[PDB]
Homo-oligomer: A and B are copies of this chain.
Amino acid sequence: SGWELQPGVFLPPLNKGEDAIINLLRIRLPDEIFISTSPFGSGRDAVPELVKHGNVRFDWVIRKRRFVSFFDPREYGTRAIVDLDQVEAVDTKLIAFNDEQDDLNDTMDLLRRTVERQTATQLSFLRKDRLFHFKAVGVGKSRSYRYMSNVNETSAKVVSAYSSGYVRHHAARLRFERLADEWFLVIDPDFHFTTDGFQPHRYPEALLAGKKRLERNAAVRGQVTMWQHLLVESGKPAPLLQFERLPVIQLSQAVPESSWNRTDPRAKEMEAQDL
């Protein structure tokens, strides 16, 4: 009689708990950092002078006439863009772990440029969107990347060409977060589209809509796993930065996924379909 009152019943989370991975890597910085003054206001201004010398590198920062780098600038063409009498090696803590917004910004820029140089075998960097994407090798050609997921060897088609023409590249925003007195790299996966592996796609918005279909838990988690492998391996003249995975996060209650796969008419929607 009338409209039935539901009891408001539901299956609770499992009390056994479960684990989750976080998309951070701990960064191990060199113990010392080099600082100096420069005649150049910013790094862009110093580039023409820098490239007059050989063995060019760009993992350095000049802002407000101040230079920073992890490498010794006296041993590279940077020796032309600094005031040499002011070059000093100091405890990295004095630049990377203080309260000055300017040192914080210069630290993050140096970390970002260091990662770019360290990963250049696999990755290309776009100034727009600050996006790091797997680079194509060959025009209109797909390629795969092999990597370890726990104890299992796996692979992904990180550059994927389609023709009736566009090419999709696995991508990530790599951000930096300081938590207490440690720096972390944050992996936020995305995709980048080109027409042929190289030329940026003239109108992303068509393709932007297909990315959303892929934003599903298992697919994003797999991509995090793959980037953590790339970046950890990148740190093994030695690479300047090493990266360390964090222990899993333990959650006291678990999603009841196996029950829901049975009861939830929308279960299949939670899984990415790559069209």
Q: Could you list which residues of chain A lie within 8 angstroms of chain B, going by C-beta atoms?
A: 44-45, 47-48, 51, 58, 124-125, 139, 196, 198-199, 202-203, 205-206, 208-209
A206 to chain B: which residues have CB within 8 Å? 47-48, 51
**Can you list 7 A-B pairs with a CB-CB distance of less than 8 A?**
A45-B205, A47-B206, A58-B202, A58-B203, A124-B199, A125-B202, A139-B139
A205 to chain B: which residues have CB within 8 Å? 44-45, 47-48
Apart from A48-B205, A51-B203, A198-B199: 18 A-B pairs, beta carbons within 8 A: A44-B203, A44-B205, A45-B205, A47-B203, A47-B205, A47-B206, A48-B206, A48-B208, A48-B209, A51-B206, A58-B202, A58-B203, A124-B199, A125-B202, A139-B139, A139-B198, A196-B198, A198-B198
* Closest 6 pairs between A and B when the two form their complex, measured CB to CB: A198-B198, A51-B206, A47-B205, A198-B199, A47-B203, A48-B209
Describe A's contact surface by its main secondary structure.
Answer: mixed
A47–B51 Cα distance when bound, in Å, is 42
A208 to chain B: which residues have CB within 8 Å? 48
Q: How many copies does the complex hold?
A: 2
A203 to chain B: which residues have CB within 8 Å? 44, 47, 51, 58
A203 (CB) vs chain B CBs: closest residue = B47
A51–B139 Cα distance when bound, in Å, is 23
A198 (CB) vs chain B CBs: closest residue = B198
A199 (CB) vs chain B CBs: closest residue = B198
A208–B47 Cα distance when bound, in Å, is 11
A21–B135 Cα distance when bound, in Å, is 45
A198–B205 Cα distance when bound, in Å, is 21
A47 to chain B: which residues have CB within 8 Å? 203, 205-206
CB distance from A140 to the nearest CB of B (A): 11
CB distance from A184 to the nearest CB of B (A): 26
A124–B195 Cα distance when bound, in Å, is 12
A98–B193 Cα distance when bound, in Å, is 40
A44 (CB) vs chain B CBs: closest residue = B205
A198 to chain B: which residues have CB within 8 Å? 139, 196, 198-199
